[model samples]
Target: DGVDIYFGMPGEISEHEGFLRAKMDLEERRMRQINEVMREWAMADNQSKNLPKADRQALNEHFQSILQTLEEQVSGERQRLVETHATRVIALINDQRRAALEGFLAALQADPPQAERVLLALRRYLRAEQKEQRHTLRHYQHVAAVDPEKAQQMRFQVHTHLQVIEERVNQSLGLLDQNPHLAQELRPQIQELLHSEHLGPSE
Candidate 1:
């Protein structure tokens, strides 16, 4: 049986994703090296027909030991590959989160009226949230392959979070429509709240 680890990024289609190709190419080369060793051993085994039994036995044992060491080394390297891939994924997630928040904050502070900028901010914020969700789902896809139940749970949380953000936007818009002055008064405070909420405890 073959051992394999998944590559994650750019949303789920593993073959077209970055790390999968690199890993697969690496494995293919390593497998060829193993094949070379096997071929060498086989040739020696056949060519040793005229040799003494003890010499043939020794040669066979030496090849077996070499193959074992190679197997161990390859497997260990693969473990490190998985670790590096995981770290890369986590870094990207953090980066995207930071950018999404920063983009919203910047858009909100552009000196427009309450209703104008709030609508702008709402659109911008929702788009960013949607993008974050897509990125998150890409990461979740690997988990889906491993455990569908766990993946479904995480996915549910992600979708619910998006809905919560949407509802908050709607509530704000409803109040803004009813009391324009109150909405304007709340803009700065709302920005502060959003800033603090983004920086505070995890969602």
Candidate 2:
């Protein structure tokens, strides 16, 4: 079942590599985070246009692939040094990667004017606002509107969620600082991970 589905990452790692098993502290947080996003997408709150179609089983199946490749490559010494955290770190990598993917099918369902604008401004593509062009992000939110306030608020809710994800991601990189030894053992993996596409901040 090689299908593309977005999953969530908590963007948190525990100093758990040594004292802890690296099992599921931050991993737990992300599980919570992903469930929450689905809740938002579920359209229960009336914030988004409609609940985008998602499958519980489908979303999780990708984890097997991610963990398999990782388990195959990591060394036993490194694994022992890292505890069980290596596997969980790989999940963070893949889940964060999954969460950001948007296909046209999903995009077509989005709120009109504001969606693209905020997307552009958020990515710093053109400007905070462009020349027609330069439109500051939030001010435009006040301006663009679509079919219903329920729809409009839905788009805004997603916009806000993106920021929440960004903020959490930025925090993940620093978790290793408290344990320089763990950081050293995990450096190669950590650096590779942080650069996996602004899934977190650059070094």
Candidate 3:
């Protein structure tokens, strides 16, 4: 007989919103700790002239340790936020794509030729969209560290990515309108997603 083994213990279900909030809290705590240590180090630096060499050396070593901890904590926090936000964005885009495809398919059912044409156009649009998404992801991956200049560059790359999506959406809207069987109601929802002010935080 094979020995039985437990896969895993069940735990309480987590509220995603609450988990995000808790992650943010931990990030803030780490930031505050780093700032506090840096402040103390600054004071020590200012008083180094009056302090003994050994005492100053000790303070410098402590400051270095704090700096290392700060970098590690902040990097982890930033990665967490990025991963969470990326998941949310991808989920939203997937939903939007599903709705758009469903609407297009329903419309094309009435006229197969038009559906074929629309699908071809969609393929072209998606090819471009996927390219842009890859570019955006690559840029973020390259600049995941805490460099302000690199971050600004990544922000601009994101904007460019969105611009490509915007163009594709505009093309989609026009194609959707050509399909008489498609519901007009879905147009507003799709358009709202494309043109809405609901994009992530600003730089």
* TM, every model: 0.53, 0.22, 0.42
Clashing pairs in 1: none
**Tens-digit lDDT track of model 3 for 148-183:** 687876787687777877676666657565554543
In model 3, the runs with Cα more than 4 Å from the true position are 1-34, 110-203
RMSD of each: 10.8, 26.0, 10.1
User: In candidate 2, how many Å is residue 6 off?
Assistant: 31
Stronger candidate by lDDT (1 vs 3): 1
The order of the candidates by TM-score, greatest first, is 1, 3, 2
Tens-digit per-residue lDDT, 122-179, candidate 2: 2331111121111123334544553455556556655775565556445533433544
Q: Give the winner by TM-score.
A: 1
How does candidate 3 fare on TM-score?
Answer: 0.42
The 10-residue segment with the lowest total lDDT in model 3: 1-10
| Top lDDT hit | 1
Quote the positional error of residue 14 for candidate 3 in Å.
Answer: 22
RMSD of candidate 2 to the truth, in angstroms, is: 26.0
Runs off by more than 4 Å, candidate 2: 1-151, 197-203
